[PDB]
mmCIF file with all atom_site columns, C-alpha atoms in Angstrom:
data_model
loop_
_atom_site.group_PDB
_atom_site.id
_atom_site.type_symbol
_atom_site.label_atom_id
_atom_site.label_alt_id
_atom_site.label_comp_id
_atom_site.label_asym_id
_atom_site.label_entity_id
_atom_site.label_seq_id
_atom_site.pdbx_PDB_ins_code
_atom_site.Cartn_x
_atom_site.Cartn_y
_atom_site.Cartn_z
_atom_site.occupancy
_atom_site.B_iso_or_equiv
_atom_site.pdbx_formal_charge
_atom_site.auth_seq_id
_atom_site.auth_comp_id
_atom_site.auth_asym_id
_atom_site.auth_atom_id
_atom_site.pdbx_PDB_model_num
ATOM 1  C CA . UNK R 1 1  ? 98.564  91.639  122.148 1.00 41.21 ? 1  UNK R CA 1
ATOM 2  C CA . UNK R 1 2  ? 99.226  94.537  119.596 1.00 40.51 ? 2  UNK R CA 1
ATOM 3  C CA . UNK R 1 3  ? 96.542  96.353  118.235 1.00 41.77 ? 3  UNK R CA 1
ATOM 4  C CA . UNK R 1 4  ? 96.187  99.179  116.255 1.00 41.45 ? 4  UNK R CA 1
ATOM 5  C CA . UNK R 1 5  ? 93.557  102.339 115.597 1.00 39.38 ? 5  UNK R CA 1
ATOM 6  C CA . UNK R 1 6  ? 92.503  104.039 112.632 1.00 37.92 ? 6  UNK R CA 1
ATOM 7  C CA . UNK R 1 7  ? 90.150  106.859 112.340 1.00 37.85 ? 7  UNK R CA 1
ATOM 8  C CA . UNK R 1 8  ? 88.212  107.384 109.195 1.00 34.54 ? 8  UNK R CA 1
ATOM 9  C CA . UNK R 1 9  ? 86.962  110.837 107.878 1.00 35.52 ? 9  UNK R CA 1
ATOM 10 C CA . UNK R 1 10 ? 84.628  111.311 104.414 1.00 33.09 ? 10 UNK R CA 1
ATOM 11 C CA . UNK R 1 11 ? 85.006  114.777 102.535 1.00 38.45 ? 11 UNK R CA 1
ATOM 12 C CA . UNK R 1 12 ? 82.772  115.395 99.810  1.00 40.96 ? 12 UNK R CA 1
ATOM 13 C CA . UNK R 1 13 ? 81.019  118.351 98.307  1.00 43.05 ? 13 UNK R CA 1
ATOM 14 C CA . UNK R 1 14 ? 78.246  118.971 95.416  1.00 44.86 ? 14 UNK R CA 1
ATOM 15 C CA . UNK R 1 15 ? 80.107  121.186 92.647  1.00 43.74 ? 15 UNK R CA 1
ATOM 16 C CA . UNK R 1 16 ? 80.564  119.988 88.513  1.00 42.61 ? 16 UNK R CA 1
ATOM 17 C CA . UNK R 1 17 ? 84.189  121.537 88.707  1.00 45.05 ? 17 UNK R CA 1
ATOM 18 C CA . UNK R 1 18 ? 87.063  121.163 90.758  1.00 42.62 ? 18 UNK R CA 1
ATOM 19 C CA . UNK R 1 19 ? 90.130  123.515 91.561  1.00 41.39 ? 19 UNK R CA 1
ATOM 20 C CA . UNK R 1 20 ? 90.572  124.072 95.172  1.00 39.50 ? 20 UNK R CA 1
ATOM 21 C CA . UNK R 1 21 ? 90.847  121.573 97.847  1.00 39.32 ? 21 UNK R CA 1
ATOM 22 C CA . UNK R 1 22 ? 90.434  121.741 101.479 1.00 35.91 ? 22 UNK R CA 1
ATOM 23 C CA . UNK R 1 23 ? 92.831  119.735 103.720 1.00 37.13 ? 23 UNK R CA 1
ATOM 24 C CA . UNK R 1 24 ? 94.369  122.634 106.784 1.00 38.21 ? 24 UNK R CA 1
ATOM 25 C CA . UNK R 1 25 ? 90.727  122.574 108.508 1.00 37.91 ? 25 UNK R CA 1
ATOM 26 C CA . UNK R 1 26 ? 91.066  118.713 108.887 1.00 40.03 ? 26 UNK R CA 1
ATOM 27 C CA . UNK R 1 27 ? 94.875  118.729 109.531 1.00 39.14 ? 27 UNK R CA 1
ATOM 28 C CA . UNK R 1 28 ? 94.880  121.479 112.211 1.00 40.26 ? 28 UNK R CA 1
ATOM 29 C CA . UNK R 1 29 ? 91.979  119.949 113.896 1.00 42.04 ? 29 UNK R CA 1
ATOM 30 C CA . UNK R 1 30 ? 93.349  116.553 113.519 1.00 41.10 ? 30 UNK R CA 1
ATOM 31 C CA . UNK R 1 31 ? 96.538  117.583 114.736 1.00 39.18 ? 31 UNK R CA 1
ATOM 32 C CA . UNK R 1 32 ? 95.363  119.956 117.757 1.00 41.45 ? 32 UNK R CA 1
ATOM 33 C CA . UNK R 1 33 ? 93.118  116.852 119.113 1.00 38.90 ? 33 UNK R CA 1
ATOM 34 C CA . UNK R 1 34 ? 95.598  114.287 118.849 1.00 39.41 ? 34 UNK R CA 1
ATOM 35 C CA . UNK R 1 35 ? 98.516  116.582 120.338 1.00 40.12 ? 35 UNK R CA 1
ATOM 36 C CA . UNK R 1 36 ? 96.571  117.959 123.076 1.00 39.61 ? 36 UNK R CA 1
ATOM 37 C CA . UNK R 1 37 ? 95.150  113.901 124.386 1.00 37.77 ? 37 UNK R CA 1
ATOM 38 C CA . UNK R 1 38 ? 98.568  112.463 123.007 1.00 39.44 ? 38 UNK R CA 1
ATOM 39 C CA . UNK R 1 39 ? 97.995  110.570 120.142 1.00 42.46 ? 39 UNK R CA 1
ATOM 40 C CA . UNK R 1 40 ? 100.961 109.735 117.604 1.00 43.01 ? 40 UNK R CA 1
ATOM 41 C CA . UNK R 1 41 ? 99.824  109.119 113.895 1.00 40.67 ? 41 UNK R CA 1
ATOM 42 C CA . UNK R 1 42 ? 100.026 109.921 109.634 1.00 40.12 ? 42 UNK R CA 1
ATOM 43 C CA . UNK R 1 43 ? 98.050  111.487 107.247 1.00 43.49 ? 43 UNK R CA 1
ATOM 44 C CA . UNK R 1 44 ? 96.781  109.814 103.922 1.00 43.20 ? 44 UNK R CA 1
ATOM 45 C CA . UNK R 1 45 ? 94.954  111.358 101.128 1.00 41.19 ? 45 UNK R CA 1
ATOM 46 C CA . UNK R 1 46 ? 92.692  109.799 99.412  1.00 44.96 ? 46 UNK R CA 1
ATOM 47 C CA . UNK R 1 47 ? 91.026  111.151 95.666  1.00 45.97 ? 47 UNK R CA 1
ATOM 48 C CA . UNK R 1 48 ? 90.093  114.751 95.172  1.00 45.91 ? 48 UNK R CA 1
ATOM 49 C CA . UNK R 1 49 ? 87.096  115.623 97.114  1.00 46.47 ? 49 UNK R CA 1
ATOM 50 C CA . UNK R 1 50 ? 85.923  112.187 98.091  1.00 49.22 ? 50 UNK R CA 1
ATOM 51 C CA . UNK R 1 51 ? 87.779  110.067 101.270 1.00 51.72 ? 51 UNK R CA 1
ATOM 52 C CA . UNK R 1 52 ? 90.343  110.997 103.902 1.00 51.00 ? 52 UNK R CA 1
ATOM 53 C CA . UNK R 1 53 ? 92.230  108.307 105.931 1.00 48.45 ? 53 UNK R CA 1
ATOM 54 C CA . UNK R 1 54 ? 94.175  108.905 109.045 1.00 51.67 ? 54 UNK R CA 1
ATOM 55 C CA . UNK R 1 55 ? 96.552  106.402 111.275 1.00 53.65 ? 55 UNK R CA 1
ATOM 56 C CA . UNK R 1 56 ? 96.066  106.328 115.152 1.00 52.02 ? 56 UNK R CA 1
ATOM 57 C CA . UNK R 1 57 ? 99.183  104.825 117.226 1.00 49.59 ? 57 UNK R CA 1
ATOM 58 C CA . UNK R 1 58 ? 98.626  104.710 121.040 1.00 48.18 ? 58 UNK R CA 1
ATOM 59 C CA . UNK R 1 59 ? 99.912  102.857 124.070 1.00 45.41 ? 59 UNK R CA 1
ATOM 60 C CA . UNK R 1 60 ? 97.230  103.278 126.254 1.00 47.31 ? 60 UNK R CA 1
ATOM 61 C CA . UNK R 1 61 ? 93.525  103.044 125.970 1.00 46.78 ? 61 UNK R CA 1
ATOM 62 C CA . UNK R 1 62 ? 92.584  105.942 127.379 1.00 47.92 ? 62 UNK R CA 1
ATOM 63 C CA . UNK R 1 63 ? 93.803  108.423 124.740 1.00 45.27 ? 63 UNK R CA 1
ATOM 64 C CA . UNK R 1 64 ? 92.280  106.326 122.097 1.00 45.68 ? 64 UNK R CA 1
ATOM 65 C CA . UNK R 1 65 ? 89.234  106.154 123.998 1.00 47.16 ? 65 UNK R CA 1
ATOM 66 C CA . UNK R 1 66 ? 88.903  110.408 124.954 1.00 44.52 ? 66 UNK R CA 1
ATOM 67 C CA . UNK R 1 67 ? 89.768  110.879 121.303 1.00 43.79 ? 67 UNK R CA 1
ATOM 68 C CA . UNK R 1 68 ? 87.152  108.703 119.539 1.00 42.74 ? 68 UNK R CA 1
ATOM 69 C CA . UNK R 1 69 ? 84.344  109.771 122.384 1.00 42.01 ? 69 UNK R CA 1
ATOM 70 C CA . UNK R 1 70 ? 85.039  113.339 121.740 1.00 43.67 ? 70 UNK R CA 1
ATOM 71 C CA . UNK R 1 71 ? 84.840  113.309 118.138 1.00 47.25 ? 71 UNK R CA 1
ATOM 72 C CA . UNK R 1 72 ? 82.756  111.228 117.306 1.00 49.52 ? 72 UNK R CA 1
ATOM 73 C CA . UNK R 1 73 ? 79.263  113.279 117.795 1.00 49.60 ? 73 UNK R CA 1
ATOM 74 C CA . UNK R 1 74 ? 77.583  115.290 115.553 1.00 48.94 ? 74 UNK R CA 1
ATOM 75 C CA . UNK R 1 75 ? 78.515  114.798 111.639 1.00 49.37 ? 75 UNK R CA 1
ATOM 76 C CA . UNK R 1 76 ? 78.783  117.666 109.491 1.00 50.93 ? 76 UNK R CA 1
ATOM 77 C CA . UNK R 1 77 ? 81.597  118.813 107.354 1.00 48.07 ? 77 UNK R CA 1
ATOM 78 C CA . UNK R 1 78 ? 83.492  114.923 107.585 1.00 46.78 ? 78 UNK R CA 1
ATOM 79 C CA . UNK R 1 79 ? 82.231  111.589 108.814 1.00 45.79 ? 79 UNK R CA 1
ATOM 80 C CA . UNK R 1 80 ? 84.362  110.578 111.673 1.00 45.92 ? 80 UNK R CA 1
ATOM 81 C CA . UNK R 1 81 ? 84.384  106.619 111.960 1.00 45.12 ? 81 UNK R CA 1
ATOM 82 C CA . UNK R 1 82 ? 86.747  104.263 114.517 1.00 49.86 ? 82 UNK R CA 1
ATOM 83 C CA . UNK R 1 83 ? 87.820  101.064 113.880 1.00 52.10 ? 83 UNK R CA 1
ATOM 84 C CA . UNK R 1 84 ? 89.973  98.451  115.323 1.00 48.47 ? 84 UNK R CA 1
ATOM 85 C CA . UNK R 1 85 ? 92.864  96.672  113.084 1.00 50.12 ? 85 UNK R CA 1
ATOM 86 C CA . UNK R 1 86 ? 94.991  93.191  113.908 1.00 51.83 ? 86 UNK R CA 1
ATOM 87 C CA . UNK R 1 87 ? 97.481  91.525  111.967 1.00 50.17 ? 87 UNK R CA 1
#
């Protein structure tokens, strides 16, 4: 009865040294996405240059559905993953 989505998005890059990070071009395109199908979740960083984790919370299954068809396409900068979670 009560199930739960989670998107999944890799960041990683090739460089010995690390200084700067880059987290507004995932966060504004996470967030203009989500606010413009309707999709209510959090943000969760995880190790410098490496993973990024993000919670989806919808009613229906048509904004989880327009959402995870319309990003997930062609790889490049992040890998964008769906998966289904139950307690």
């Amino acid at each position: 009865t009560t199930y739960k989505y989670i998107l999944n998005l890799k960041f990683a890059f090739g460089d010995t040294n690390s200084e700067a990070v880059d987290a507004a071009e995932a966060e504004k395109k996470f967030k203009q996405y989500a606010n413009d199908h309707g999709v209510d979740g959090e943000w969760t960083y995880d190790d410098a240059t490496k993973t990024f984790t993000v919670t989806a919370k919808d009613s229906h299954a048509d904004r989880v559905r327009e959402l995870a068809q319309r990003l997930r396409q062609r790889p490049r900068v992040e890998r964008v993953e769906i998966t289904e979670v139950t307690e």
